[PDB]
Symmetry: C3
Subunit: 274 residues, 3 copies
């Protein structure tokens, strides 16, 4: 199809950007996984049948190619922390697209592509905080991109596209508030700049709260899976059944550690807010 042709062209551009950074192998490592994931995504999409799913994978991969170009720029100039944030966004989009396509959602991959483009804009706003001296605003943008990454990863687990949409609209609203805070910082008026930056911190907290409740909903589902295996264990206390229960117990620990990790970062945002 015509949409499949612009994907091959997008794939060709990705191959060029993958071969462009022959000097840095670490980014080229994740740059090749994006070529592998998209190839798997397109072949998995044509197996599924939905052509709408084939189009939204392209737009997200088109955004991921530009984020890779930011990862190349992040080495020579900008913070090295920005490079890791660019790579974290790349691997997050790769894993989010794969699982969302394996789930067979034509709408979840859409908002994943929508949120990835919005998160790409926030990274661009972070660069204005580097040229125009604003390391504090540079953190807010990196903290916001971090909150979007956690929102996308957990919403793909839930398979809820509405959560990705609501996380993208709050992120896009916060990005324009950082742009207004940058235009403020340029034009003085720090009574407006400080109120805009606290509005952004409020929106970063509003995102991490939705991520915390989503991780809590996953912790409930694992709890029910653990309850049904206990009621199974009371019937047949076998040797292999206990091994499976131990595996599910550790799976619940992984989700609780991530839930305590989000609340640990969300609690620092409140200390910055107040």
């Amino acid at each position: 199809a015509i949409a499949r042709a612009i994907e091959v062209a997008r794939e060709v551009e990705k191959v060029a950007q993958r071969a462009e950074e022959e000097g840095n192998p670490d980014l080229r490592d994740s740059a090749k996984e994006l070529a592998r994931a998209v190839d798997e995504a397109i072949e998995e999409a044509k197996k599924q049948g939905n052509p709408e799913l084939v189009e939204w994978v392209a737009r997200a991969a088109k955004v991921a190619a530009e984020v890779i170009k930011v990862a190349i720029q992040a080495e020579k100039e900008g913070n090295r922390d920005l490079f890791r944030a660019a790579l974290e966004l790349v691997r997050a989009v790769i894993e989010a697209i794969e699982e969302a396509v394996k789930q067979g959602n034509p709408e979840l991959v859409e908002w994943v592509a929508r949120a990835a483009k919005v998160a790409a804009e926030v990274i661009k706003v972070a660069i204005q905080a580097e040229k125009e001296g604003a390391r504090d605003l540079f953190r807010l943008a990196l903290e916001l991109v971090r909150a979007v990454i956690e929102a996308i990863e957990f919403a793909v687990k839930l398979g809820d596209p509405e959560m990705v949409e609501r996380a993208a609209r709050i992120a896009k609203t916060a990005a324009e508030l950082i742009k207004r805070a940058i235009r403020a910082k340029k034009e003085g008026d720090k009574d407006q700049e400080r109120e805009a930056k606290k509005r952004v911190t409020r929106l970063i907290i509003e995102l991490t709260l939705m991520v915390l409740k989503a991780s809590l909903d996953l912790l409930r589902r694992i709890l029910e899976e653990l309850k049904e295996m206990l009621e199974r264990l009371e019937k047949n206390p076998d040797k292999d059944v206990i091994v499976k229960v131990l595996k599910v117990i550790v799976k619940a620990i992984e989700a609780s550690v991530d839930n305590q990790r989000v609340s640990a970062d969300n609690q620092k945002m409140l200390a910055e807010l107040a």
Copy 2:
């Protein structure tokens, strides 16, 4: 006794309110469980012997009957979220009374009846926020009733009547501050209204903090029960002993998930406060 007679009369009023809402079966489902629980409570009380316990179950059941009348009103008018909050309070009082009577506490059921009447007043204040346009104040009242429900449920687990008393005095003090915030909103003076609403949010946080520490005290007791079964396991690594340990491990997970659930809701109150 004379006190037992006003309980039968209170039981007759409950039967009438249970039969009044013949149209809605879902509320009638929980309305009949209250008739079953009180009957069990009165028969359990006369088996225990203490007549003071028989009186405080009546006053709480008299309050629960009026909350049911609010649940009937909450369908045709008011928020549907208010109906679920009314039902949540009913099932919470039912389970709190049962466990507190099975524990044999003549003082815990008292403050449970005291806190249930105070929580009923807060629901009444929420209705003033519906007529007098105040959806923000409507949340604060529903958030406050939610904090009282968690405070009563965990304090009945601890069997601590002093915690219920202190949660009821903070809730009654906060309710009068919402009334003052409503009388403020009526008479302008939003410098006083905004300070009264933030005083309420501070008290809602002060309650959820006491609920979080109480759930943490329960998490310690389960930890000691898990330690004593490990030291038992080192003596006899049997097949059935491991099954009991797995059950206690999941019981600790249920308490930790609830503790992370309270802190997740308590953290949103801080975002609203600051």
Copy 3:
């Protein structure tokens, strides 16, 4: 050596202070464990060989002797809560020194001695809040010492001396801000006093956040130890292997309960801040 001689003299002073409080047995219980721990520490240090480790154990034990003298003073005068805070600091320094010496760190014991002396200064500032009427400032100092105790205990687990140094510099900066808040409270100017006390609360939160992330790093290491034993269990689902996995699962629960305990106390600091 000459340094070993001032340790024997310091040990003699500790024996005198241990025998001075013959009336109170509970403090004498922990006072004798300090004599046992230092004796073990000096003998363990001469076995290790490093003479620098022998010197820093003395300075921390010299500070711990003065904290014991505060524990004696805390009975007849001052809050009884201050006595428990003094004992908590003593047992924390005892266990921190022991583990840090068994780990063989000549630099971790240094900053443990540095942080113990800084924490001793904060306790002295708490006494000024008792004479000069300031129970609110008395809590801030006791809350700050509590945050230092948690910071030292978890950093000794990590074996990270840089964390102890950064926790000591924030604690010393906060202590001078409480001194400035006390000199403010004396000389009126509550616009400066209230801003200094909120600066201290911000620094107390900044410490507990570093303690929360450190406890989260320990929770990751236990997670990897639990993953490697699962992959071991898939190879050999034995009887004794499951027992060891159950022990590691409970070890992870102990770390998660402590992590939820720190966040529970850190969340009350935000309610006091905002």
